[PDB]
Amino acid sequence: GSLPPVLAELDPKGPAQAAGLKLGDRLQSIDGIAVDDWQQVVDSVRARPGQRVQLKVLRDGEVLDVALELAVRGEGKARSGYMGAG
Amino acid sequence: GSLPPVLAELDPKGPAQAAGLKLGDRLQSIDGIAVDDWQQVVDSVRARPGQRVQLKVLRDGEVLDVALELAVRGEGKARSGYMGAG
Ligand SMILES: CC(C)[C@H](N)C(=O)O
Ligand SMILES: CC(C)[C@H](N)C(=O)O
Ligand code: NA
Ligand code: NA
Ligand code: NA
Ligand code: NA
Ligand code: NA
Ligand code: NA
Ligand code: NA
Ligand code: NA
Numbered sequence: 304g305s306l307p308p309v310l311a312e313l314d315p316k317g318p319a320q321a322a323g324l325k326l327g328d329r330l331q332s333i334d335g336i337a338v339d340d341w342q343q344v345v346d347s348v349r350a351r352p353g354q355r356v357q358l359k360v361l362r363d364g365e366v367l368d369v370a371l372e373l374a375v376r377g378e379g380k381a382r383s384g385y386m387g388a389g
Numbered sequence: 390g391s392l393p394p395v396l397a398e399l400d401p402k403g404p405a406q407a408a409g410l411k412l413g414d415r416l417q418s419i420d421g422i423a424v425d426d427w428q429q430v431v432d433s434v435r436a437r438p439g440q441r442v443q444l445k446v447l448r449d450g451e452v453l454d455v456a457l458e459l460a461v462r463g464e465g466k467a468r469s470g471y472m473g474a475g
């Protein structure tokens with residue numbers, strides 16, 4: 304199964320809240336590449352520790368640009384990019 | 390230039406209103422193929438006179454399925470599919 308790429312939880316100390324993202328925001332693209340579902344967001348974020356990514360986001364009928372500075376979480380094999388959203 | 394695929398006008402006697410579409414609806418896909426912008430909607434509708442097409446549409450945060458029965462308008466070279474929306 305797959306889910307729409309809509310934010311339902313935010314880490315108050317994480318990158319997504321710092322970037323101005325909000326519950327209910329729907330991610331449309333990351334660095335110009337459409338995101339088809341939430342798992343695509345997870346996979347792309349995890350692969351990009353420490354990287355700035357450019358989002359297009361839909362919020363209440365308006366398409367917005369958002370710059371998101373991914374953090375780093377985990378150790379060894381598990382070290383991954385982190386956005387602070389679910 | 391391009392525009393998001395959002396309905397801003399509807400023919401009260403046309404297929405889109407009959408299908409249950411509403412101002413502000415955002416078309417996401419036609420027959421499972423993403424629509425990137427409004428011109429893609431125009432081109433796909435015009436090419437499909439008389440055809441039923443399956444839409445995914447975003448309305449106020451909810452993804453909806455909509456079956457749209459395209460009509461026919463125009464004569465000769467200009468004969469085209471018609472959805473009744475702008
Ligand atoms: C998006 C995913 C990788 C994770 N839930 C995070 O906050 O980064
Ligand atoms: C979508 C386009 C082809 C036209 N405005 C129509 O109503 O069909
Ligand atoms: Na969606
Ligand atoms: Na950020
Ligand atoms: Na990954
Ligand atoms: Na929206
Ligand atoms: Na941006
Ligand atoms: Na859009
Ligand atoms: Na119809
Ligand atoms: Na066409």
Ligand code: NA
Nearest residue numbers: 447448449450
């Ligand atoms: Na919406």
Ligand code: NA
Nearest residue numbers: 443454455456
């Ligand atoms: Na449908």
